[PDB]
Amino acid sequence: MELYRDPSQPIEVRVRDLLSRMTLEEKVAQLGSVWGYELIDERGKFSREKAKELLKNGIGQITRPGGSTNLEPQEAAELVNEIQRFLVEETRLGIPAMIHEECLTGYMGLGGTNFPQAIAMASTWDPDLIEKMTTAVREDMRKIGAHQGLAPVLDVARDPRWGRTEETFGESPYLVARMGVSYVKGLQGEDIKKGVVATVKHFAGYSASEGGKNWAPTNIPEREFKEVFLFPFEAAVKEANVLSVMNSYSEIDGVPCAANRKLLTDILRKDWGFEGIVVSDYFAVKVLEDYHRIARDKSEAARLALEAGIDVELPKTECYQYLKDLVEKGIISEALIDEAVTRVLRLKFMLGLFENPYVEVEKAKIESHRDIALEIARKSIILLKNDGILPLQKNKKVALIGPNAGEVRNLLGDYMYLAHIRALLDRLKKSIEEHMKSIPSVLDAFKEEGIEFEYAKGCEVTGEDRSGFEEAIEIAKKSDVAIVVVGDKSGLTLDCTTGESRDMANLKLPGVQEELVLEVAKTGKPVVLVLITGRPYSLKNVVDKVNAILQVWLPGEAGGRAIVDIIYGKVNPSGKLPISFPRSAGQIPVFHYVKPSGGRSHWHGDYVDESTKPLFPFGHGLSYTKFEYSNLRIEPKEVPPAGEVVIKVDVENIGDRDGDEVVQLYIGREFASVTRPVKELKGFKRVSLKAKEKKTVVFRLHMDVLAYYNRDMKLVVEPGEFKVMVGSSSEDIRLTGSFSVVGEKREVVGMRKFFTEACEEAAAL
Amino acid sequence: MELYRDPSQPIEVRVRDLLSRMTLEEKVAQLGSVWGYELIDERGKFSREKAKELLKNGIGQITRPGGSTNLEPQEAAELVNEIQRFLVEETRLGIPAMIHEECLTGYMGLGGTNFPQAIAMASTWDPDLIEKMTTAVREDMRKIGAHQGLAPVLDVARDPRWGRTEETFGESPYLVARMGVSYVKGLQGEDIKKGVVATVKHFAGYSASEGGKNWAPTNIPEREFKEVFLFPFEAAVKEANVLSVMNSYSEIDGVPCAANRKLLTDILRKDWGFEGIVVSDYFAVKVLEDYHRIARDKSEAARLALEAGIDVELPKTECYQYLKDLVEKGIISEALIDEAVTRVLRLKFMLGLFENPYVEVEKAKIESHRDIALEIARKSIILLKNDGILPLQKNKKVALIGPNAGEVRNLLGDYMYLAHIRALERLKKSIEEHMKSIPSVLDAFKEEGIEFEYAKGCEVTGEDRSGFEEAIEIAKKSDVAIVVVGDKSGLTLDCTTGESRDMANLKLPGVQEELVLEVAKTGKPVVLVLITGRPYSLKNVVDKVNAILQVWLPGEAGGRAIVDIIYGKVNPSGKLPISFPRSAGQIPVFHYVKPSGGRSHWHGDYVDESTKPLFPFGHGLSYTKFEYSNLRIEPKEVPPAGEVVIKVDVENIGDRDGDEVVQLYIGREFASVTRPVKELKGFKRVSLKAKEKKTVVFRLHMDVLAYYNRDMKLVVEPGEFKVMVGSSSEDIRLTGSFSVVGEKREVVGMRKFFTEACEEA
């Protein structure tokens, strides 16, 4: 038995022994990939004929054996077992594949639960619930033999034009980092042999493209880059031990991220100590030539990406095959190939693949997690406006109007399988239609709740056709209340309004949906506006014309029930905005953590034509009950530069309905050596409060958490005063106080705390 | 006679001698300033009583003795002479003051010509004409005893929300740099003793604020900062020998520019060799405390600004008085004060102030430069659209409609005196009186003998549509409707553009868009005239009107130039210096995007909008047709510090004489960094009679093409450069390429900034 085959040997011994046995061809094969669909016949069965050509020298990864094959979970598990058996038994060294899938909103394949989108996850402000979600996703994935999920997205979004806003955790580096760490911890667990490699993406800056345009330059200066864009990745690497990173398609200031050694190696590996694998975004190596025009051919693109620190070319070997030629021709050192192969082999050993690369097909039946999906949907929906119309009485006659009340397809996000796969489509068409039919609808939910309603489509999500307006207006006039359900169709194709590749310059609700809302409102009937969307839209032309507004970030299969639960008060809405809502596209960007000079035009404050304040601020979300904050304690009042302050507030549900509050901690600083945000989120806690219940929320805030970059790009804590602002949104501050850092300016070196510890205690009798 | 008083001594000897004689209090006073209006009595005469307090220890500068006092030129000159006499005769050392004024669009005071705004100057693509302008401004300034003009603005604008777009030369670092060097050369001349110190502003990045918002953060990474924002300043420093720089109010990435030594010293002085003075933007030192919240008091703000490299606090001493206290308390070294005072004294000696600080009041009468203002206005107006309606025949009955046809105030830019000073009852009446003498758009139509009726239609601001009916009725009775809409520029809430007036959504102000659309509904031919300071979204009007003229805020020559162009007495020849977005949500749009810029991948467009601007950089039509032929590029292979000569023939094949602005764009792929697909690197305005052909020649040194590599080195790399010559950035007529051959070159020390452009037969 060779040392690499021997599970009694330490991982590093097995890696070194295996690498010493490998040919250059076998090494380069470990840095590439093949699509699952390239390995199947016409009946979705493993094809030995196709494997003999593609797998003969081994392979790094199989790309989406479930997601790219339209196989049911047991069929996908059988495919993955036959691929692994071919590699284990019919290649010289018997190295198994790593399998990856998309899993942002759950495993992206037939049979997997459609969880609410990432921006909905962030709107829960409940990191533990997201960890519970990805712990369930972990088991779904391991059942089909998948080792790696291409999630989560840690791109910080302040530009709602961008079609991938829905895949983010929003604008706050703090909230994004906290949701990201929980997401990763759920997927991976402690021993990765029993878990799924998380893939934080898209490193880094990809959410800040010129004009909000997909793949366009992300031109971010250094302190902003470190504190806003890199921070959540840094937390995922150092605190959550994330085992994969995927690069950004964008350039930063002239340098494509896929060709940037200073990013993918010097920051991620050298500064931060990342020991996992870097996987390319799909085709990101090839497009160094085709798109960015900095590589003259596929071999130059391969060299740039390997020097940068990409270990695996996804989704299929294309440039990385030329790494063999580059070594043979004495252009690159085989030592640089060895470095990448060592990272891939180490992770394959840690996943236990050399001990057991197979799964039990009899167990590959994925369980529904509708329960978890519903908890997220119920906690994620945000009450943006309520003049008192909500919650509705069940005896009111409803006119249910709008395309997103009537089309279950429009509840789906861009990485939910039945929306995403439409890009390929452009026997399979009938399979999609059949699975679509099983998703419970908004109509179904109103019917189950026993509401007397009539439905009018009103208009499509896209186009200019107003011929359905008259029917909607007529049912509105015959009803007590109009529930107008409008928003997006998310995906990758031209008929989609949001999603990857679907950027919206002017932030108007798609098609004639705004005009539909305004025509319904002209009847004089009460109007509840339900936004089923992937991005903030400009609501300035409808906000004062409607009685209530619910923001329902693309909720997946649990959406209908959660919406109707909230409308009728069976659930007390508790979501809070994780991203600011601009008044208009021309106001972009708006975000809560502006510097003193940000968020305003000096010296009149506003634009000529527009307020500089967002229409709804970060952290905004109303309730059917009232929360009363009291008894701010901050101890001690003077803390040294690596000390800790404990901030406590009492929160009482003083209303008549049980409900959750998301208590938010904002920290402000002035008279630093650099300008600082006037307020920035640095802690939060979702707290359940029965009617008349009072609890204490405690924030344990280490000074490490407040560190920022000074004039000389050093991470510091400087003596001075920090303002403490606790409240129900970034604007709805309820209690304010301060503490001082006392002592010598501190350079924060090495490992440091990222997060405030947030918990609940009994309030005093 | 002390050495400093002796003009036979070299200036370094005089500076060292004077510095050695000065008290700390006298040194610190040279780093401050006083407003002109603080030194006058209620009749605008020099007040010895007020000077005794403010000037007793000398002074660095007097702020706007003309611009801040509402004095006519001879009265301003008398005031300046009396200030200088007090300094020379009643202070211990007799150091004269430097006087500054605003002068962007000409000296900003009573009696000075209102030249077209800077964005109009750029639209001429005629740097020699702008040098001619600032040569005239130089003489106007020296007549009143002014030594320094706070111009030009070298901020590169790609965000038309920003209210100071009108003060810029537009989006192109190349065109901004080339207009800037000519502007500076005109103001200064060769011997500054005979000229005016130019002040390049606002160093640097001030035009790229978050959301287009005045003073908001300008968060620009390093290569973009070097190649877009710094480049024009670098050219002004190294090629035009500019003698003053003013800082930006904005932070870059957490550091206010007024507190940034790495910017105001390490780049400007150390890397570039600048030897002049840095003046603060007004109150930029104090607001390190009040606005940015990085200084706890005025003494900390003073320390941050002096360490950064601000030599003079403007517009009045406030924080810099505490520099005395900071030395006496052993917080800063007097050597750091000496360094700033040395720069200020050197420039005072170079200006000849110690030999003759006075002017002849009998000669202080400023001459009109309406001739130069009219040449700029006639060359700056851009024909954006023309279906053939223009030029009009003189016998057509005109319905002249809109607020900007009727209100001469709306022809003025934000640094033209009679608009700017409104930001502040004796003054109100004086402004009204001076306004009377500015020729109007109505005056120009009358002088031309046009049969027209005028209807206001609406105001620039507000929602009042009650004037619409009168406009629609005169349109229905006319042959053609000429609808003249746009901005009111200045600093107050009633202004739609100008400093502090940022427009988020780029809709024409008020109900002007609705006025245009109601007039078009009559079915009459419509000529749309935009008298504006920024690009506006024309998406809802462009397809409804027959012709569109862009008239950047033209000042006093505007009426005549507009009527000249409409009737074809002048063939329009302006070209856009800034892209026109389809919508605010499209921002930014600019011609020199990287291959991944200017598009959304992989569908190309937004869901709701093209990614292409409505009108591109360099766009401008003519009443004639130009035919480009015979592209030559020689040699086809050049080494990395070599030179290529690009020639094209241009023939006016139409029936009207006209100027063409021939534009050279360069592209590069397969560099070590991504490069613009096309970027302006040369241009030439060429006069062509009907049926005339000329050769345009571009001498392009490889220094001009240098860019920053992965290691932030300025390089020329071997490979292919694409040559694109045309009538706009989109209307490319002829393309070819040449190669750089040899080893990658690091471009060190002095290098060429500009393509040499000329005409041959």
Ligand SMILES: O=C[C@H](O)[C@@H](O)[C@@H](CO)O[C@@H]1OC[C@@H](O)[C@H](O)[C@H]1O
């Ligand atoms: O089905 C199509 C695939 O989804 C891809 O081809 C491609 C365009 O759609 O985009 C990349 O694909 C991998 C993702 O992990 C990543 O987030 C995304 O940036």
Ligand SMILES: O=C[C@H](O)[C@@H](O)[C@@H](CO)O[C@@H]1OC[C@@H](O)[C@H](O)[C@H]1O
């Ligand atoms: O006194 C009025 C001033 O004109 C103000 O408008 C002032 C803001 O308080 O703005 C600065 O003033 C100096 C100009 O040279 C510079 O361009 C500009 O940025």
